[PDB]
Amino acid sequence: GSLIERINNKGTVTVGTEGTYAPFTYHDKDGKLTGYDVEVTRAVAEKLGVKVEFKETQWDSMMAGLKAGRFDVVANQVGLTSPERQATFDKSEPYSWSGAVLVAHNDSNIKSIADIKGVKTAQSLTSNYGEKAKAAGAQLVPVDGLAQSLTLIEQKRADATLNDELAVLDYLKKNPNAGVKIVWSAPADEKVGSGLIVNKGNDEAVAKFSTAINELKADGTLKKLGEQFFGKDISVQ
């Protein structure tokens, strides 16, 4: 039947997801499809009493796939920030929130984006966080990426780096040796929220997904899933 009918009649919902992007949607070492985004969707499905089937495809196919009706829903860290994409898709209540954070040495007293004006700040010169550092008046120290940026902070050849909350938390959880720490996080209004994406004209279906999401937010489940994949609740804006 239609999506809302299948949701209401304990039917089957199809979800597009990449399966090649840890810790969001990936194959664990036994082969199981898991990750933050897959596990949220499994718990949402369980709230609505619906069965879920994941359809694994790469990003560019995922979206055309959704629009073309190859699945009902897409789950893949999609914030849908572009006004142009908002005219073609609807997004549920977000089940996770990410934004810029500031990382410095364990010995550091930096606190804000103001504290790095003129400071040595490790970034890739052509990355979106490079532009942010340079805009904030930082002295850029060139690296290729996150691991190299923290190596430099460890060696004291840079004092700070700007990057994404969830990339950083994922790195610090796998590398607890770090010796570095988040000293600032963008406030709520600077954060981007990821949600289940569906085609236009499914308002009743989205409301249900949102409602299930909020249910999972309040009964503790999203907090359990954030702690498992990131060491933190990532469900709060």
Report which of 115, 155, 152 is spatially closest to residue 137, judged by C-alpha positions. Answer: 115
The Cα 207–Cα 73 span in angstroms is 13
Tell me the residue ranges of DSSP E strands in 88-187: 89-91, 96-98, 100-105, 120-123, 139-142, 160-164, 180-185
Q: How far is it between the farthest Cα atoms of the chain?
A: 61
The residues, ordered by sequence, that sit 6+ positions from 102 with a Cβ below 8 Å of its Cβ are: 110, 112, 113, 116, 160, 161, 162, 182, 183, 184, 185
Beta bridge partners of 73: 15, 198
| CA atoms within 13 A of residue 22's CA, in its CB half-sphere | 10
Contact 13, 73 (CB under 8 A): yes
Helix, strand or coil, per DSSP, at residue 147: helix
Q: Which residues precede chain breaks (C–N over 2.5 Å) in the chain?
A: none
Phi, psi of 147 (to 5 degrees): -55, -45
Report which of 9, 211, 172 is spatially closest to residue 92, judged by C-alpha positions. Answer: 211
The Cα 141–Cα 157 span in angstroms is 8
Amino acid identity at 115: D
Contact 31, 69 (CB under 8 A): no
Method of determination is X-ray
Calculate the dihedral angle through the C-alpha atoms of 180, 161, 76, 93, rounding to the nearest 10 degrees. 90
Report which of 87, 79, 37, 98 is spatially closest to residue 197, judged by C-alpha positions. Answer: 79
Helix, strand or coil, per DSSP, at residue 199: strand
Domains and CATH numbers, the chain: 1-95+195-230 (3.40.190.10), 96-187+192-194 (3.40.190.10)
